[model samples]
Every structure is written in structure tokens, then in C-alpha cells.
Target: MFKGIVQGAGIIKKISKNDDTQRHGITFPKDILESVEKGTVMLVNGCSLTVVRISGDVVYFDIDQAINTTTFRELEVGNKVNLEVRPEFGSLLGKGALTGNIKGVATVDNITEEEDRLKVYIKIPKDLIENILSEDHIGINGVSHSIEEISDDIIFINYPKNLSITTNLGTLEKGSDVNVETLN
Candidate 1:
């Protein structure tokens, strides 16, 4: 139900945590904050959260550590369904996920621990490597990929373009975490 890619960026104003309750409050910039309203869903740096309240450009939400019980039971076929809102472009392939994702347990496959740069390995569907170029610019999680090589069942995912906008993926060494979600 999402529209498409969200290009603008919002800075984190404040993040308050309550240790006992395991709850946190986060505030984003006011300009884009209006999009966040009570019961609205958002992906903050790839983390999904729901808004509980709004104050000006600041919004309040709780970590959805647990899925709502009613919603969980209602996941069966034939019912009124509500979906999360999302961007309109850029996020082309990651939208409309029906089946579970193809995830890789990212590891610094070829680098030492203390090195300044990172070498990563994400074990995706070994068979899809051949058709990757046909799916260029597809998003895995929030990061986009341009296919490198599809030899056998495993495809090699490059990190340069995606790293430019995001964090230091190049500096990540073995056993680091990388997010992934494939299109159906």
C-alpha cells in the first residue's frame, strides 16, 4: 500500500529511553514530522515503528517488540487489512513484500577484524544470481543493489553506490550486520 521511495532525510532530534519499561521516545525534524501521526507506521533507518502521538513536528511512538495480538490473529485470509504507508519512488523493488525475505547473515568474509574497511558476505538465493541484472536497482531491505556477478546459485552484491548515501559499508569487516529484503 506504500506509494514509493522517500528521498528526503530527517535528523534525529531527541531519543529518550526508559530502561525499566524498555520503551523509547524519538523525535524527528518538524518539516516531515507531520507525516507521522497516531497509528501511522514508519521505517526509521530501516526499523519499523508506529506513531502514538504528535507534538508539532515531533512524533511519539513505542517499539513494536511484539505484534498486536488481534492483528496477529486477523492475519488469516478474508478480512479488512491495513498496510503501512511508504514512499513513491527509489524504493521500487522492496515494496509489496508478500513472502518472507531472502536474508543473508552478513559476515566479513575476506577481511580481518581490526581493518578499517569491511568485506561482507550475504547468502542470498543461490539460484537468482543469473537473473539479477534484469532486476537492477532492486532494494534489499532499504539498500539498493546493482548486480555484480551471478555465477551459480549465489550472486555477488556490490556495495559502492549503496554505501555512498548510507554508512561505511566499505569499512565493515567480517561478522557485521547488513540488511536485505528481495522483491517477489
Candidate 2:
């Protein structure tokens, strides 16, 4: 129901606690939520969470349990989280694809930049290695990117020009939290 086509990166603006669950306020771009409703499901960092409230461009979530647990809970305010909305019907497989449900939150370790191309080095969980192979499409922060190289616990992506401009791909920095889903 979800696609890896991310609208953009959302900044975590607030985090508070409730009796048992936790409430978070993350600011998103207006366009991604144009038709989004209060109960809509959103993929943040590839983890599915319900949109419990909305105010302006910010969506709130009250979560008691979370998947991709450690990686997601470690997320703090000021971090940039990938945002994706579920598609109404069949999801696209990006030869170019949701798959909002993800395995782990990868880490942006290094990057090589060029004028027309970019190489992103992301360190994923060791257990996630077998599922990903070079030439297979991978979703990062909701955006499907072709794999350029795969190494010991790492993936290198050859970024297209579109990735550099349209989305938040250009803003990735060292130690940036990355949410990854395999396009199947």
C-alpha cells in the first residue's frame, strides 16, 4: 500500500510523553498532506505510524509500541525523517516501489559527489544484507534508488540528477538516519 516515492524529508519538531504512549510532532511539506486525513497512516523512516493529529503542516503521532524499534526510538528531535504516504492501489516497482514496511534504519556513512552524479554510502543492518543485492532497487527514506554497489554491511547508490534536486537526497550528511525498504 505504500510506495518508496518520498515527497521530502520531514523535520521532527517536538517530542513529548503521555501516560503510557509518546506523542511526537513532525513538520512535513504541505503538498504531501494535501489530502491526508487525521487517521491516515504514514511511513516515517519506513516505520508505519498513525497520524493522530494535524496542525498546519505538522502531523502528530501517539505511539505506544514501535517497530524497527531501536533504530526508530533512537530518533530524536531535529533529525530528518523520511515521509511517505500509502498509495490507494497497486504500488509501483521502480525497476524504477512502498513498501512502507522496512527492515532497519540505515546510517549514512559516507558520500562521493560529482557534478552530474552522486554516490551514497549507507550502512545497513548486517542482517539486511541478504535481502539486498547490487542492481536491485532499494528504497531510502521513501525514494527508490538503484543500487550501485553493495559491500560488507554497506550499500552504495548511484544517484540520478532527479534525486539530487527534486527530493531531500541532496541534504544527506554523515551519520544521517536512513530508512530503507527493499522493492520486491
| Candidate number of the best lDDT | 2
TM-score of 2: 0.80
- CA shift at 79, candidate 2, in angstroms? 3.2
TM-score against native, each model: 0.46, 0.80
Off by over 4 Å in 1: 2-22, 55-58, 65-85, 88-138, 150-155, 159-163, 166-174
Residues forming the 10-long window of minimal summed lDDT in candidate 2: 66-75
Per-residue CA lDDT of candidate 2, range 99-148, in tens? 56666667899977887786789998676644777867887866776788
Q: What is candidate 1's lDDT per residue for 73-135, written digit by digit as tens?
A: 112222111122365353444433322222332223343223332223444444332234435
